[PDB]
UniProtKB/Swiss-Prot annotation, chains A, B, C, D, E:
It catalyses: uridylyl-uridylyl-ribonucleotide-RNA = a 3'-end uridylyl-2',3'-cyclophospho-uridine-RNA + a 5'-end dephospho-ribonucleoside-RNA. Changing residue 114 to I: In strain: Omicron/BA.2, Omicron/BA.2.12.1, Omicron/BA.2.75, Omicron/BA.4, Omicron/BA.5, Omicron/BQ.1.1, Omicron/XBB.1.5, Omicron/EG.5.1. Homohexamer. It comes from Severe acute respiratory syndrome coronavirus 2. The chain holds residues 6453 to 6798 of 7096 of the full protein. Uracil binds at residues 291-295, 342-346. Residues 206-345 form the NendoU domain. The gene is rep. Plays a role in viral transcription/replication and prevents the simultaneous activation of host cell dsRNA sensors, such as MDA5/IFIH1, OAS, and PKR. Acts by degrading the 5'-polyuridines generated during replication of the poly(A) region of viral genomic and subgenomic RNAs. Catalyzes a two-step reaction in which a 2'3'-cyclic phosphate (2'3'-cP) is first generated by 2'-O transesterification, which is then hydrolyzed to a 3'-phosphate (3'-P). If not degraded, poly(U) RNA would hybridize with poly(A) RNA tails and activate host dsRNA sensors. Likely affects Nsp15 binding to RNA. The record marks 295 as: Uracil recognition site. This is Uridylate-specific endoribonuclease nsp15. Residues 64-189 form the AV-Nsp11N/CoV-Nsp15M domain. The active site is at residues 236, 251, 291.
């Protein structure tokens, strides 16, 4: 019994769509939904999507308010659509998926994921919702998350963090670590062994290991001494070189976080979306060092050290493929005389 | 139980809002309402009003589909709002009135016209709706239309024509001639003696008298001979003078209609709204004669002849006030040697 | 090697997309594409679709410029997408189908219809394009049109008319009558026996039989006499009754065409799309007779007479199902004393 | 002698509308007003209102630049319109009122508040403007503010703070505490005894009493000990419970301010407007505790303690009505064994 | 070989336009350019200019990514257009100039600055680009910047700072100090002796001299004592007077920076553009002191002290003209009894 005024009533009275009965007067102008409160219009939703305003408003109101996988993880697993929920992409302020199943009459391709239209699409299933583990078992393509064991199904432990209403966090009052399962053409696939990105911000970066605590506290030459990193080009790769017009390295988020405490810099997010590897046009404010495409990855420093220390350094240039967030990331490894020159997430 | 999807269901299934239950999926883009019909969007309403798209859509769906007074008549009588209906202005493709009573939650100032908010406004009442003659009796300010007698109330016979879904016509299968009543501060007013404009189109003009039949069939000098119009400047005023750069006269719609059969002309309606007197920037295609503001009135030729023949012609210039469509229309009368030079609906 | 400036170059220089090389400067404002011609912007395309302006522009430039099936026929046959072409819906000024195959990078779901994404969709194939009869043979779901015989495939003769650049016509210099074939899950279907709508306009209606020539020339009571139509309510159904406030019958386009020569009327197309049965809110200008939902079908009068004369008239009300344009159209048959009262394409 | 170019001249040259003579070239595109400065367009005003761009621009330029009552106070007193000024709502970036009196030709319902149209509306009068105390005396409905005594009129001391150009503050160089007067139907009404909200921000919260200084400095169990708050559920109500998936209590702004210093949290203002009680969808970043509708009020902790300590605690659940900012706020009081379980501003 | 999809490919893959070959699917909706990434639209550019969206997108992608003169300097020198580059105005998010030369087909007035159309316009030339010093020599009107000497041309040393991707800085890894040259009507003009504004922010203000270090550390009466500023009204002019309703003085950015550390204030930038003298509507949050037009200049305190100490103080009021950023700034000097009362950048 869906309607614009009923979705708006739910937004005004419940903070989101809660299936409540009622209507509030709504007015649509430009790409913004308004409601009349004591004679005047009050903005409820500014549409930043490529969907019609009322359709985007309904999808946002029907967004999942439970901790869910980060959009980069769902994308890396090939999720096309979600079963009976909307995964809201908070970075893009838009639905993570084009179509829906049992959510909105305008975007729905089906009411239930068991409809033959869904068979070729990778449907996201949530084991926390009743019947969705069974729906995953009968779906030809899909990705399932659960809080515990699924009889017979071999699990893949996902990252510790999940997104709750746009806030990435490692849950204390809620579970954020899920078991992951994937199926392609009716067959359960073996999810690869993988590292996970840490999903930290540059402004509120917090070290998550003793190595990371030492990197941020210690000076460059003494940290490299303590962790036996001589010859691995951490000076260029992690710390960054701000001496020439073109900024050198600076590919690990922790390096950007360290630099940020001393002097500010501009990071232009020219493809603003959640992704395992991010690309920024960086301009260092202090020196004027800059780089058009500086690929940045947020790995735990211990994981990055483990990755770089497990490479054969006897070749000038090669592609090193590492599974991170379930996807294969290609790193360009440059060496000279058995020592690393640079190691960066390869720009395709 | 109003909603956008329910108004749209009524539009799609009943042609207008009929109070039916149901919903159809709707999408709003730009200022247009669309509905999904077998996978594709079909336009239902393009907003040409200054109201929000969804609000205009609802008001148009809730328009009065019965023959109603033309907007120029309602305006001339000072109608501010209508009781429990929407008068759709088809010349502007917008609601004739700013607010509503018992129609739409966004535009409603009241649910019933008996609310004290309505007392200072001239409410339009329709005797054809049960209880509205009584509502008019208790309203402080109002305009009432009826098909027959109202006990005690002295009627004012309105024009023969009414607007049915934007089509002005003299009804054969429906009654279009109404009795009119008006109240100002609780007192039933004596509506003045009035002429009525004929509301005819230039393209499909039809004569409504023998004088009008003769005007369109006979040549200029023989019509003026037959009707003793010598010295009344019908050559300039009605027929029009296309000999100089500035078009002479041409203020009566019948004259424009006659000219139209021989050669076409451009009429720029720069204030496109329903009004007793219309103003056009006219460019005659055959001669190139033109005039920025050519005021045009559609009076029955017999009425215009009666008006001009009842004027004292012994003064160079004066204002002749005529009650047309219940309003006072000032005309400018120009004379010389006891004969008319020009007579036009005055530009203020 | 697709681009906005290249599509625009093709539009400006070839009238449509012809695969030519070149670019013209383009500017996009509002929902309109402009091109600079000697210092000033000239409109090329105004987007009336729900797609992004540049995407709609490309699809319209890449429209099929050959006579193709009318959108109502494709819809009735369940066509979801077209193979390597765009069917432009000129009644909606939008693409007939949501997605494309080998046409535009933004709307493409595949490059070739042989991709497994297309298997569950009914793909439209054009025998006039090389290899498309073979593509239809290997497609699981599809609709095929041809100019002649396909070995082994039993044909279904389609209507005489086809749409050429939005102009429906029976071709003299081009073939417009196609053989139709359909497959559901790999099985060649037996297309039902069907009547066809004539797709005529009200303004330029032309009779296509002696019965139709007689209907338009003869008076009501003598036509009904000549064709033994006494007791079939053609007076109400076809001719129309303009005596009461609610317009009676008027469900056959030929009747609207006949009425149109005597007096004009307003037809509000509230669901403006190509369909076998059309619904209009009609207001007769001469009488003021009106009806919110007047279903109108354009059948050849001989076909309508054959349909109504082949019905059992011994029941008050029943649903009469007729295959028209390959689809099942429900009609409502109302009888009394063995005679027809009304027979109209049923409003669901 | 109003004009768009004259309002723009005043904005460019005086920072607001100052009644100066002159014009600057203006261009309107989208919903933004621009001015040409040395060959290029410079944004003057981005319209975020539901009014036409030029109308909103004029109202914003004509905004009151003196300390005025906060919009929540005016709303709580039922103010419909202001006399000869615009109260700009900085939180909504729109005029606080639909219409004006003597301000803008597009929004004006009258030029002077003495016009009969204003009689039924509660007009806001400013005693600091000459003649407005007299206008209030003759107005049927209205709200008056003054800096001192009005002969015969019994005053209501308002809050210490007022809004100056969107900045809420307790004035040192200007008076921000006003006397308030209200009239309904020609009769001066007795304004109730009321508490006042403190209007503080979460990010720049400052304690305004020794109790508040102790709440922010002291730990939970020692503050409750010092102020004899045992059994009043301040642990749940003020401090907040972040242990379960649903966040417990957290209804006093000071509690949110204390929590904010330790760890951040998201507050979704889903009805973004000035109001005595605010509703937020809160997501605690540290724990993942969340609540869809967390009603938040900014009372001085001493006032909240006085309110909760003056309640009978011998009932399971009841509505406690408290006058705050002149309006009656309903609080839901939940008790068990003579002790408080929760006390929150009741969600209607 | 320019195209929208090629500019977008360059933005996605290089961070800006780099002349690379390739295309990415693009969609334009509203005034925003999007690209499809794994099924969903990702925003590439939100148009805030008065140019068409695709044109602004191309100009922004083709922006100069090298340290360039700040827009205020180019404006002060009368620059109309740039040679074969786009100077992006980051404060206005728009191109600094209306037209281009050899950049975009929509905005280009010429391909090379040697075309007679450019002769009357002051073209900006960059000596760092090959052939541009020669182009300047043959241009009738122009402004040239270089890193070193130009044979025969007498240089003007510009400011230390330049804008790199919107970041104003004094370069360490890149040169930001340029030599400036100007030509009017084929004749090299002598650039005047000039002071330079420091281009500092209020939030991240840093002292650039011992006098500035002392101003920020020392109290008002002791700083004035140390620098012999008694009688120069620094208390009013630089420190600001927040005691009356109208804020006194506060015309030097360093004064606003000092005040900012103690208490916050609102600065309304009503003409948001880069300029030597800025105008703000300031509201002090602590006191409620305010001023509609507070002209603010960021001079090094030593330079401002030198300017004010080099004035004759024996007149009530006079205009003091000082060349700053190459332009003549008029200062209003008010004196009494041989002492300064106020000294502010005169509001024209
Ligand atoms: C997360 C979110 N909420 C809203 C109201 C939006 C629209 N910009 N986005
Ligand atoms: C009379 C009318 N019908 C419609 C669908 C409109 C919107 N332009 N106006
Ligand atoms: C058939 C058609 N041509 C054009 C240029 C359009 C856009 N309204 N539609
Ligand atoms: C307070 C305010 N000033 C302006 C220019 C606006 C428009 N967003 N709002
Ligand atoms: C500097 C800049 N980049 C972009 C994507 C814009 C559009 N707002 N402006």
């Amino acid at each position: 019994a869906m309607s614009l005024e009923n979705v708006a009533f739910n937004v005004v009275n419940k903070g989101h769509f809660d299936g409540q009965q009622g209507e509030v007067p709504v007015s649509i102008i430009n790409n913004t939904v308004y409601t009349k409160v004591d004679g005047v219009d009050v903005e409820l939703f500014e549409n930043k999507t490529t969907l019609p305003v009322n359709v985007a408003f309904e999808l946002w109101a029907k967004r999942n308010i439970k901790p869910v996988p980060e959009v980069k993880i769902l994308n890396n697993l090939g999720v096309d659509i979600a079963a009976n929920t909307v995964i809201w992409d908070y970075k893009r302020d838009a639905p993570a998926h084009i179509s829906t199943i049992g959510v909105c009459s305008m975007t729905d391709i089906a009411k239930k994921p068991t409809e033959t239209i869904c068979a070729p699409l990778t449907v996201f299933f949530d084991g926390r919702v009743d019947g969705q583990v069974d729906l995953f078992r009968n779906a030809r393509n899909g990705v399932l998350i659960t809080e515990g064991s699924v009889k017979g199904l071999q699990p893949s432990v996902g990252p510790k963090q999940a997104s709750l209403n746009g806030v990435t966090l490692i849950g204390e009052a809620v579970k954020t670590q899920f078991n992951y399962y994937k199926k392609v053409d009716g067959v359960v696939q073996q999810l690869p062994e993988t590292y996970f990105t840490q999903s930290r911000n540059l402004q509120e970066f917090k070290p998550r290991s003793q190595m990371e605590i030492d990197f941020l506290e210690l000076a460059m030459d003494e940290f490299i001494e303590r962790y036996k990193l001589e010859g691995y080009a951490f000076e260029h790769i992690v710390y960054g070189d701000f001496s020439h017009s073109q900024l050198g390295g600076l590919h690990l988020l922790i390096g950007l976080a360290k630099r940020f405490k001393e002097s500010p810099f501009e990071l232009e997010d020219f493809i603003p979306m959640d992704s395992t590897v991010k690309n920024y046009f960086i301009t260092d404010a202090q020196t004027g060092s800059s780089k058009c495409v500086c690929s940045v990855i947020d790995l735990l420093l211990d994981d990055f050290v483990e990755i770089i220390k497990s490479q054969d350094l006897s070749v000038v240039s090669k592609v090193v493929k590492v599974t991170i967030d379930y996807t294969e990331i290609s790193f360009m490894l440059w060496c000279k005389d058995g020592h690393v020159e640079t190691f960066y997430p390869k720009l395709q």
